[PDB]
Amino acid sequence: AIQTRTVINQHGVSETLVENFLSRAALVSKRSFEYKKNFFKWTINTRSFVQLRRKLELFTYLRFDAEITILTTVAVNVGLPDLTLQAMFVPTGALTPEKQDSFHWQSGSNASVFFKISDPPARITIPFMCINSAYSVFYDGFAGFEKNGLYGINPADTIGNLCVRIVNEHQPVGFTVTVRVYMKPKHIKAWAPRPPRTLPYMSIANANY
Amino acid sequence: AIQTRTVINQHGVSETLVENFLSRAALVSKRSFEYKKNFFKWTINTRSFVQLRRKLELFTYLRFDAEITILTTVAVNVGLPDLTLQAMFVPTGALTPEKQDSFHWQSGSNASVFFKISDPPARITIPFMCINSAYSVFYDGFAGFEKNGLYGINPADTIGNLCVRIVNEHQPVGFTVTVRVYMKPKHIKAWAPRPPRTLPYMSIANANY
Amino acid sequence: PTGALTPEKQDSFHWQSGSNASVFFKISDPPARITIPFMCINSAYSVFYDGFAGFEKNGLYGINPADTIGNLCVRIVNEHQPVGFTVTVRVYMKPKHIKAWAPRPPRTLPYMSIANANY
Amino acid sequence: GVPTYLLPGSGQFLTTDDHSSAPALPCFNPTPEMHIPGQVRNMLEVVQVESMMEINNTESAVGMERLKVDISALTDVDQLLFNIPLDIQLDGPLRNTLVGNISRYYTHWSGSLEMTFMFCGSFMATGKLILCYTPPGGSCPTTRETAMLGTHIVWDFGLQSSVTLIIPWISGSHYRMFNNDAKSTNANVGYVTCFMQTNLIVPSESSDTCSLIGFIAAKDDFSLRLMRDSPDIGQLDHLHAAEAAYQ
Amino acid sequence: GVPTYLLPGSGQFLTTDDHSSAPALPCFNPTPEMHIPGQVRNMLEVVQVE
Amino acid sequence: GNISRYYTHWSGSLEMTFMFCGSFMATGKLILCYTPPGGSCPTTRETAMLGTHIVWDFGLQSSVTLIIPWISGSHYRMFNNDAKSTNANVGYVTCFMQT
Amino acid sequence: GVPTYLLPGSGQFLTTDDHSSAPALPCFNPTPEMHIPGQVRNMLEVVQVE
Amino acid sequence: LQLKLGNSAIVTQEAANYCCAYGEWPNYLPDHEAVAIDKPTQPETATDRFYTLKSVKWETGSTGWWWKLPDALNNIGMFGQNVQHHYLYRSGFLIHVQCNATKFHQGALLVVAIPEHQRGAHNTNTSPGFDDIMKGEEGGTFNHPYVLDDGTSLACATIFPHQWINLRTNNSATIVLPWMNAAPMDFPLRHNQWTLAIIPVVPLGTRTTSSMVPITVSIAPMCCEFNGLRHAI
């Protein structure tokens, strides 16, 4: 426990701006699947890891873009022949595939990328797809009207989900695929600051303690 | 022992400038690790090899940038499937990972690169991150105040450390990784020249003889 | 170049020397390429030198000490692997920015050595 | 889009190239500059500073007794005191100076020098010396009479206590000219030698031993080229904590 | 065409870089902005509150 | 102290404000010292009056304002291993009962 | 960034091409030129001698 | 021929020159409101007094002396009291070294001032302790002066600001030292910027035995300032 000092001279103000307070491309999903549920489905919620959930709940309303980067690292359970993947983005109102060889992967209307393993990782940016003017982080209301609706789910707030599939046919080798997704918020406009949370989180759906 | 001569005509002065006296990208680290301590951690001190330590101690204060280039050469202990690496740069105040699968590799705040083996080698440049105005090469003081502090360690002088990890899952083959780091100082401004050292070095911490 | 030491073993400490220039190229890339400036300390390369470097009575005839350039050294970087392989190196040199002086008659009889003009 | 094709020499890594790089931390402001006194911009501002040499080139002179020569009262006339072989790269009086350590990193050097002596006797003591300069052709003179016909000055002690001797021109290289690893030493350019003209004259109260100190400094046309690495320390030895960083 | 060559550091992925990206849905108009009161632009407007 | 956890280096001036929540009739005095970062915390009232003090009562005002001139800080991970070096204690603001 | 695509004939090595190259030693000044007498510029100045 | 600085005055010197170390004077902190913004008290009339140290003895077998300049004045006088109850200072110095011998002595000194002189222990793997560095007013002694106790040679030690005391010609030296540090203000109890060191190159001699030839060192802080101890509220 050595107690030191150093004088500090600074001039910068433009480092605490909200535009470059949240532009850091944190990890948001990490899930494996074995191919021999044979695919990766993930809703595009942001409150999955508590390092970025607490930082994002200082504000009430904010507005941004997505900038998804999918990084796939394969293995054989020695060399793998030229694997090709598909990463289809399914918004609301379009149906999600339930099986690997479904007819929903052939749907033209929703956007899809086709990237090899040997390439640099895939990258698409997703526009602001709320039907309000901003994402309500905290919603003090009920989607379900009558007496039984889940508290604090805004029906206008949802984005979609993305689905990742090995394109190739059944091969005599069986391999394990690990998918990591990095999201980088762009063009931030944040409103109405709020006090930060001290007690630890208990669920993904609500603010219990 | 043949003694020869040749007349010499020169005009150049701009070869002994300090800007291109230290811009030569010398090797600063070389350490292997086997994956089957499973990673590479190295503090960003510069006095590790005595070819570049003596050349850097002609001056008292200097100021530069880093320009790190990481060159990784793998082997299997015949062909290796598509290895992906991560090289996270951990400054002061942020925590360093102690195990390969720690939760500190998922930290968004510190910068990381993701490079394959088959690519050209990775490269990031690091700004001047002292909190004085220059790096004190020779420090005539104590960080520890009371009676027991290590002599000549400036608490404002430190930079950080970088950590290199195989991203992939446990595979049935076990391989040996060798990492080389090349640092190239850019934008030199050096002050107060000092006489060069003749007797050989004895330790990495101090100037004994 | 001249004045810097040449490595005598594969894992010598002269490969880690920062001062001399080095390239690091894979096999799968297109081949490596560097250009080397005019590093004589006269104003031109003496092809034919009518003199002695060694002064006294025993110097090799026709070796100009100002004429030399250097030497290049090529090494497999990787560790000892359980497979042993054979490497073949070819070097192609392409002279640029020629300025030639004083033409001479061409040689008819065949060469006998690499050091001198015998016949 | 634009149509491209790759050259040979694509994706390599020279250690001497100059290209831009991706910043690891954008939107980071470093600490601003401050006027710290004594900035050096060129390494020819270091070699122009005077720095003393080792005149006492005899064996078994251990310590800081190498920096001075004694001239006792019981010394016969015309006896040579010292000579300096003007060689930077070779072991002698000019090996461990300030001009002989910066010009180890470079290969070719050519310029003019400037030597300065200084006498450290008592105030009463007198006498004369003589200081010759031999051009790079001829060899070192042995007697005083054969050395007077060169370029000499006759310096005494009572009037001045410091002299200045301009060396006109030197040059050098390293000359690795053969097939194998051989070394060809450059030929010995110049000498500066000193003889005793008259005897030393001290009174009955001062001590009978005096001393000389020599300095050296390059002039403003000393040039250097083709940087290499210096062998001055030694390759590598045992460092006590050689892996502080790893653990 | 134009002659190129690749630098070292080609095809990596920094988590702090800033480059353009292929839009997943072109020809899509988001909902327009509205004056929502209380916009914060700099985080030194938060620390000055008692 | 929650926004300046996300950042490493901080340096600036502060502003403290007290407020008294007694009844309307009640009176009395206090005294409010500020210790610069060199010296240590005072223990008695007389050794604390010689510093920088104000003598605040209750009947006239119910709020006071005390400008703190300058602070600074960092984290200082200076060794080889994972160690923590706490910054030295800058300043104190202490309060004694006058009457 | 700018969008590219590779032609056929990309990454080969003709022995007669003319392109720039990475200098092995930048910041190095060669020895300057000197008027050495008898410069030949074209090889039709050699065949005209008896 | 006197140096009247404030309260005291070293009178009756030999002719001398203010060879400024490098090219600058103290300068008084031209503009830094970004750091330690309690304006420096800047005492000027009650610190500048030529604190003369103890006279040291120069014999034939002597080998050298060294003082750490913010350390040699921590317990002496009005500058010594301002080091306690202040933690930031900023000052440059002035040094006047004067020995005195007759016209029958012979010798030579090298008065050099070394910025950031990190010392080193001989033939061990342990860094020097707190007690081998913070010696105080008495100073120290070179154990191996030929390598300046850190390996860098004495033959190249004229790259620092220096003057010669040659007892044939003169017996006085004067160096003015500016603020040489990376930070704008520094901590006086644990960091020492300069290091005054005097080394006899040619040892003395006379017909009789061991004449003392006592030397005097005098130090005076030039343009000093400290943090603010008095604030409004």
Task: Scan for tokens 């811009």, then name that residue.
Answer: B23
Question: Is the distance from CB of B61 to CB of H181 less than 8 angstroms?
Answer: no
Within 8 A of H88 by CB-CB distance, chain A residues are 7
Domain of D38, CATH number, reads: 2.60.120.20
Angle at H190 between CA H186 and CA H193, to 5 degrees: 55
Residues 2-41 on G with a CB inside 8 Å of D are 2-7, 9-13, 19, 21-26, 28-29
For D34, the closest chain A residue by CA position comes to A9
Look at phi and psi of residue C91 and say left if phi exceeds 0, alpha if psi is from -120 to 50, else beta: beta
Do the chains H and C touch each other, judged by at least 3 C-beta pairs below 8 angstroms?
no
Q: State the SS3 of chain F.
A: CCHHHCCCCEEEEEEEEEECCCCCCCCCEEEEEEECCCCCCCCCHHHHHCCEEEEEECCCCCEEEEEEEEEEECCCCCCCCCCCCCCCCCCEEEEEECC
Per DSSP, the three-state class of A184 is: coil
User: How many CB atoms are located within 10 Å of the residue D128 CB?
Assistant: 14
Contacts with A147 (C-beta within 8 Å, 6 or more apart), sequence order: none
Cα–Cα distance measured from residue E4 to residue D4, given in angstroms and rounded to the nearest whole number: 6
Q: What CATH number does the domain located at B1-209 have? A: 2.60.120.20
C1 at B interface, C-beta within 8 A: no
**Planar angle of CA C59, C61, C63, nearest 5 degrees:** 90
In 3D, which of H106, H131, H107, H128 has the Cα closest to residue H117?
H128
Closest CA in chain B for residue A118: B82
Which candidate, D169, D174, D175, places its Cα nearest to that of D190?
D169
The beta strands (E) that lie in chain D are given as 2-6, 51-52, 69-70, 80-85, 106-119, 128-134, 151-156, 162-172, 191-196, 211-218, 223-227
**What is the domain count for chain H?**
1
Are D and C neighbours with ≥3 CB pairs closer than 8 A? Answer: yes
What number of C-beta contacts closer than 8 Å exist between A and E? Answer: 79
Cβ-based contacts of F78 with chain B (< 8 Å): 92, 143, 153, 155, 158
How many domains does the structure of chain D reveal?
A: 1
| D28 in contact with chain A, both atoms CB, cutoff 8 A | yes
Contacting subunits of F (3+ beta carbon pairs below 8 A): A, B, D, E, H
Which helix H or strand E contains A53, and what residues bound it?
helix A50-56
In 3D space, the residue among D121, D23, D8 whose CA is nearest the CA of residue D71 turns out to be D121
What strand order describes the sheet that includes H195-205?
H65-68, H195-205, H106-113, H162-166
Q: Judge: D32–A9 Cβ closer than 8 Å, yes or no.
A: yes
- Between CA G17 and CA G36 the distance in angstroms is 31
**G6 SS3 class:** strand
Q: For residue A166, how many C-alpha atoms fall within 13 Å in the half-sphere facing its CB? A: 26
Residues 6+ apart with CB under 8 A from H207: D204, D205, D206, D207, H104
Residues in contact with C27: Cβ distance below 8 Å, sequence separation at least 6, in sequence order? none
Nearest Cα to Cα of residue H229 among H35, H86, H63: H86
Q: Calculate how close chain G gets to B18, using CA atoms only, in Å.
A: 12
Provide the edge-to-edge strand list for the sheet that holds B186-193. Answer: B135-136, B59-65, B186-193
Classified as helix, coil or strand, B205 is coil
| Cβ proximity of D206 and D152 under 8 Å | no
User: What φ, ψ does residue A115 adopt, rounded to 5°?
Assistant: -130, 140
Per-residue buried b or exposed e for H2-40, using 16+ beta carbons within 10 Å of the residue's own CB: ebeeeeeebeeeeeeeeeebbebebeebeebeebbebeb
Residue numbers of the domain that contains D204: 1-247
- A window 120-139, beta carbon within 8 A of B: 121
- Tell me which H or E stretch contains D100: helix D99-102
The terminus-to-terminus CA distance of chain E in angstroms comes to 63
Which experiment gave this structure? cryo-EM
Q: Which DSSP helix (H) or strand (E) runs through A63?
A: strand A59-65
- Smallest Cα–Cα separation from H115: which of H175, H59, H202? H175
Please list every residue in chain D whose beta carbon sits closer than 8 Å to the beta carbon of residue F81: 247
Sign of CA dihedral B129, B135, B138, B144: negative
B and G interact (at least 3 Cβ pairs within 8 A): yes
Residue D5: closest CA among E4, G4, F91, C111: E4
- Domain at H130, CATH number: 2.60.120.20
Experimental resolution (Å): 3.6
Residues on chain B touching H133 (C-beta within 8 angstroms) = 142, 151
* DSSP conformation class of A108: S
Per the rule left: phi > 0, alpha: psi between -120 and 50, beta: everything else, H123 is left
Chain E residue numbers with beta carbons less than 8 Å from the beta carbon of B122 are 8-9, 12
Helix (H, G, I), strand (E, B) or coil at B56: helix
Q: Which residues of chain H make contact with A7, given a CB cutoff of 8 A? A: 35-36, 88, 183-186
Phi, psi torsion values for D43, nearest 5 degrees = -80, 5
- Domain range for H168 is 1-233
The minimum CA-CA distance between E23 and chain G, rounded to whole Å, is: 14
Q: Map H50-75 to HEC letters.
A: CEECCCECCCCCCCCEEEECCCCCCC
Give the span between the Cα atoms of A161 and A184, in whole angstroms: 16
Neighbour count for residue D135 (Cβ, 10 Å): 12
> Is residue A74 packed enough to be buried (19+ CB in 10 Å), middle (13-18) or exposed (0-12)?
buried
CA–CA distances in Å: residue A188 to residues A54, A62, A160, B120, D136:
17, 7, 20, 34, 76
Nearest-neighbour CA in chain E from A59: distance (Å)? 9
